Amino acid sequence: SPRVCIRVCRNGVCYRRCWG
């Protein structure tokens, strides 16, 4: 399946969340 990514910021630090 096609990869997936989203945004994950905890009010200060942003992080990229991806899975299979």
Q: Which of 2, 1, 4 is nearest to 18 (CA)?
A: 4
Q: Report the length, in residues, of the chain.
A: 20
Written as six digits, the tokens of 11 are 């009010």
Q: Which method was used? A: NMR
Dihedral sign, Cα of residue 9, residue 14, residue 15, residue 17: positive
Please answer whether residues 16 and 4 qualify as being in contact, where contact means their C-beta atoms are separated by less than 8 angstroms: no
Per DSSP, the residues of 1-20 read ---EEEEEE-SS-EEEEEE-
| 15, 19, 2, 14: CA torsion to nearest 10 | -10
